[PDB]
Coordinates of all heavy atoms in Angstrom, one line a residue:
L14 N 19.2 2.2 7.1 CA 18.6 2.7 5.8 C 19.5 3.7 5.2 O 19.5 3.9 3.9 CB 17.2 3.2 6.0 CG 16.2 2.3 6.7 CD1 14.8 3.0 6.9 CD2 16.1 1.0 5.9
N15 N 20.3 4.4 6.0 CA 21.2 5.5 5.5 C 22.4 4.8 5.0 O 22.8 4.9 3.8 CB 21.6 6.3 6.8 CG 22.6 7.4 6.5 OD1 23.0 8.1 7.3 ND2 23.1 7.4 5.2
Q16 N 23.0 4.0 5.8 CA 24.1 3.1 5.6 C 24.0 2.3 4.3 O 24.9 2.3 3.5 CB 24.3 2.2 6.8 CG 25.5 1.2 6.8
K17 N 22.8 1.7 4.1 CA 22.6 1.0 2.8 C 22.2 1.8 1.6 O 21.9 1.2 0.6 CB 21.5 -0.1 3.0 CG 21.7 -1.0 4.2 CD 22.9 -1.9 3.9 CE 23.0 -3.1 4.9 NZ 24.2 -3.8 4.6
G18 N 22.2 3.1 1.7 CA 21.9 3.8 0.5 C 20.7 4.8 0.5 O 20.2 5.1 -0.6
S19 N 20.4 5.4 1.6 CA 19.2 6.3 1.8 C 18.0 5.6 1.3 O 17.2 6.2 0.4 CB 19.5 7.6 0.9 OG 20.4 8.4 1.6
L20 N 17.7 4.5 1.8 CA 16.6 3.7 1.4 C 15.3 4.1 2.0 O 15.3 4.8 3.0 CB 16.9 2.2 1.6 CG 18.2 1.5 1.1 CD1 18.2 0.0 1.6 CD2 18.2 1.6 -0.4
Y21 N 14.2 3.6 1.3 CA 12.9 3.8 1.8 C 12.4 2.4 2.2 O 12.7 1.5 1.6 CB 11.9 4.3 0.7 CG 12.1 5.7 0.2 CD1 13.2 6.1 -0.6 CD2 11.2 6.7 0.6 CE1 13.3 7.4 -1.1 CE2 11.3 8.0 0.1 CZ 12.3 8.3 -0.8 OH 12.4 9.6 -1.3
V22 N 11.5 2.4 3.2 CA 10.9 1.1 3.6 C 9.5 1.4 4.0 O 9.1 2.5 4.4 CB 11.7 0.4 4.8 CG1 11.6 1.3 6.1 CG2 11.1 -0.9 5.1
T23 N 8.6 0.4 3.7 CA 7.2 0.5 4.0 C 6.7 -0.9 4.5 O 7.3 -1.9 4.1 CB 6.3 1.0 2.8 OG1 5.0 1.2 3.3 CG2 6.4 0.1 1.6
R24 N 5.8 -0.9 5.4 CA 5.2 -2.1 5.9 C 3.7 -2.0 5.7 O 2.9 -1.6 6.6 CB 5.5 -2.4 7.3 CG 5.6 -3.9 7.7 CD 4.3 -4.6 7.3 NE 4.4 -6.0 7.7 CZ 3.4 -6.9 7.5 NH1 2.4 -6.6 6.8 NH2 3.6 -8.1 8.0
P25 N 3.2 -2.3 4.5 CA 1.8 -2.2 4.2 C 0.9 -3.4 4.6 O 1.4 -4.5 4.8 CB 1.8 -2.0 2.7 CG 2.8 -3.0 2.2 CD 3.9 -2.8 3.3
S26 N -0.4 -3.2 4.5 CA -1.4 -4.2 4.8 C -2.5 -3.9 3.8 O -2.6 -2.8 3.4 CB -1.9 -4.2 6.2 OG -2.8 -3.2 6.3
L27 N -3.3 -4.9 3.5 CA -4.4 -4.7 2.6 C -5.4 -3.6 3.1 O -5.9 -2.8 2.3 CB -5.2 -6.0 2.5 CG -5.7 -6.8 1.2 CD1 -6.7 -7.8 1.6 CD2 -6.3 -5.9 0.2
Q28 N -5.6 -3.6 4.4 CA -6.5 -2.6 4.9 C -6.0 -1.1 4.8 O -6.8 -0.2 5.0 CB -6.9 -2.9 6.4 CG -5.8 -2.7 7.4
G29 N -4.7 -1.0 4.5 CA -4.1 0.3 4.3 C -4.4 0.8 2.8 O -4.3 2.0 2.6
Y30 N -4.7 -0.2 1.9 CA -5.0 0.1 0.5 C -6.4 0.0 0.0 O -6.7 0.7 -1.0 CB -4.0 -0.7 -0.4 CG -2.6 -0.1 -0.4 CD1 -1.8 -0.3 0.8 CD2 -2.1 0.6 -1.5 CE1 -0.5 0.3 0.8 CE2 -0.8 1.2 -1.4 CZ 0.0 1.0 -0.3 OH 1.2 1.6 -0.2
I31 N -7.1 -1.1 0.4 CA -8.4 -1.3 -0.1 C -9.3 -0.9 1.1 O -9.4 -1.7 2.1 CB -8.6 -2.8 -0.4 CG1 -7.5 -3.2 -1.4 CG2 -10.0 -3.0 -1.0 CD1 -7.5 -2.6 -2.8
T32 N -9.7 0.4 1.1 CA -10.4 1.0 2.2 C -11.9 1.3 1.9 O -12.7 1.3 2.9 CB -9.8 2.3 2.7 OG1 -9.9 3.3 1.7 CG2 -8.3 2.0 3.0
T33 N -12.2 1.5 0.7 CA -13.6 1.8 0.4 C -14.2 0.8 -0.7 O -13.4 0.2 -1.4 CB -13.8 3.2 -0.1 OG1 -13.3 3.4 -1.4 CG2 -13.0 4.2 0.8
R34 N -15.5 0.8 -0.8 CA -16.2 0.0 -1.8 C -15.7 0.3 -3.2 O -15.5 -0.5 -4.0 CB -17.7 0.2 -1.8 CG -18.5 -0.8 -2.6 CD -20.0 -0.6 -2.7 NE -20.6 -1.1 -4.0 CZ -21.8 -0.8 -4.5 NH1 -22.7 0.0 -3.7 NH2 -22.2 -1.2 -5.7
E35 N -15.4 1.6 -3.4 CA -14.9 2.1 -4.7 C -13.5 1.5 -5.0 O -13.2 1.1 -6.1 CB -14.9 3.6 -4.7 CG -16.2 4.3 -4.3 CD -16.5 4.2 -2.7 OE1 -15.9 5.1 -2.0 OE2 -17.2 3.4 -2.3
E36 N -12.6 1.5 -4.0 CA -11.3 0.9 -4.1 C -11.4 -0.6 -4.4 O -10.7 -1.1 -5.3 CB -10.5 1.2 -2.9 CG -10.2 2.7 -2.8 CD -9.3 3.0 -1.6 OE1 -9.4 2.4 -0.6 OE2 -8.5 4.0 -1.7
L37 N -12.3 -1.3 -3.7 CA -12.5 -2.7 -3.8 C -13.0 -3.0 -5.2 O -12.6 -4.1 -5.8 CB -13.5 -3.2 -2.8 CG -13.9 -4.7 -2.9 CD1 -12.7 -5.6 -2.6 CD2 -15.1 -5.0 -1.9
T38 N -13.9 -2.2 -5.8 CA -14.4 -2.5 -7.1 C -13.4 -2.3 -8.2 O -13.4 -3.0 -9.2 CB -15.6 -1.6 -7.4 OG1 -16.6 -1.8 -6.3 CG2 -16.2 -1.8 -8.7
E39 N -12.5 -1.3 -8.0 CA -11.5 -1.0 -9.0 C -10.6 -2.2 -9.0 O -10.3 -2.8 -10.1 CB -10.6 0.2 -8.5 CG -9.5 0.6 -9.5 CD -8.3 1.4 -8.9 OE1 -8.2 1.6 -7.7 OE2 -7.5 1.8 -9.8
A40 N -10.0 -2.6 -7.9 CA -9.1 -3.8 -7.8 C -9.7 -5.1 -8.3 O -9.2 -5.7 -9.2 CB -8.7 -3.9 -6.4
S41 N -10.9 -5.4 -7.7 CA -11.6 -6.6 -8.0 C -11.9 -6.7 -9.5 O -11.8 -7.8 -10.1 CB -12.8 -6.9 -7.1 OG -13.8 -6.0 -7.4
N42 N -12.3 -5.6 -10.2 CA -12.6 -5.7 -11.6 C -11.3 -6.0 -12.4 O -11.4 -6.8 -13.4 CB -13.2 -4.4 -12.2 CG -14.6 -4.2 -11.7 OD1 -15.4 -5.1 -11.5 ND2 -15.1 -2.9 -11.6

């Protein structure tokens, strides 16, 4: 990541983002 340019990497999953009923309602609407 250094070698290629001080990059950032993330490995997300839906459960890391849509965690509450409120988050689900925002997205789903």
Side-chain angles (χ1 to χ4, degrees), residues 14-15 17-27 29-42:
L14 304 180
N15 178 174
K17 306 290 191 184
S19 287
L20 305 179
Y21 287 82
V22 66
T23 185
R24 208 310 185 180
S26 78
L27 229 194
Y30 286 70
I31 306 293
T32 68
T33 74
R34 188 184 150 195
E35 311 76 80
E36 290 183 327
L37 175 67
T38 302
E39 182 201 9
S41 70
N42 287 332

